Write a protein that binds this ligand. Structure first.
Ligand SMILES: [Mg+2]
Length: 199
DNA sequence: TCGACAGTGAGACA
DNA sequence: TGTCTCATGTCG
């Protein structure tokens, strides 16, 4: 496989094109058709007098019997459906890793974005694999100390059919964003595969 | 609650 | 002047 290695102080990611266009088109259509997102209908749930947010506008699938936590609650993901198994297997096939969980986000146009954040490290093992379909969207890495010092910025279009692996310690020293882009009008679907520890 | 996203001011440039 | 990009406040 042909990989672009994105390297900098505390940043190890690599990027490749996982699926050719024909196949990326097919899979995208199947995703749009088949994935079931949480609606907005239920925002919060309260226990012991303290509220807890409930996932909205995302879908989670994973292995039977698995549980993950979210905003303090413990959930079960939907069991895998075939298009996701197909995608998981290609990722596995090209990295040597296994994954038991995927978080799917849909960005219906360039107004949908994600603000700077660092993944919830607490429940993970190991590399996060991010697979993109639909419209190309720029993805941005900013160092968590850049205020103290001035560290470089790294900017990467995540293209249709692509795979971005984020390996240690990329998620420890750098925040990530998917910034707004008005010019972009078509939707993007992103799949983030993880391995949730049984411990 | 605290996580997703609304809101906003500075700067760029058309 | 108008839209965009970058980098604290709110609320369910
Ligand atoms: Mg993330």
């Amino acid at each position: 496989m042909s990989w672009r290695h994105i390297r900098a102080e505390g940043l190890d990611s690599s990027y490749t094109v996982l699926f050719g266009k024909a196949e990326a088109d097919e899979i995208f259509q199947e995703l749009e058709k088949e994935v079931e997102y949480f609606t907005g209908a239920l925002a919060r749930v309260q226990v012991f007098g303290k509220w807890h947010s409930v996932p909205a506008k995302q879908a989670t699938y994973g292995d039977a019997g698995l549980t993950y936590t979210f905003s303090g609650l413990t959930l079960s993901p939907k069991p895998w459906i075939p298009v996701l198994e197909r995608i998981r297997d290609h990722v596995s096939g090209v990295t040597g890793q296994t994954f038991n969980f995927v978080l799917i986000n849909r960005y219906k146009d360039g107004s949908d974005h994600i603000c700077e954040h660092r993944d919830d490290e607490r429940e993970l093992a190991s590399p996060i694999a991010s697979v993109s379909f639909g419209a190309s969207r720029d993805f941005v890495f900013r160092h968590k100390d850049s205020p103290s010092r001035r560290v470089a910025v790294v900017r990467l279009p995540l293209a249709h059919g692509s795979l971005l692996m984020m390996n240690h310690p990329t998620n420890t020293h750098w925040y990530h964003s998917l910034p707004v882009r008005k010019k972009v009008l078509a939707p993007r679907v992103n799949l983030t595969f993880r391995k949730i520890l049984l411990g």
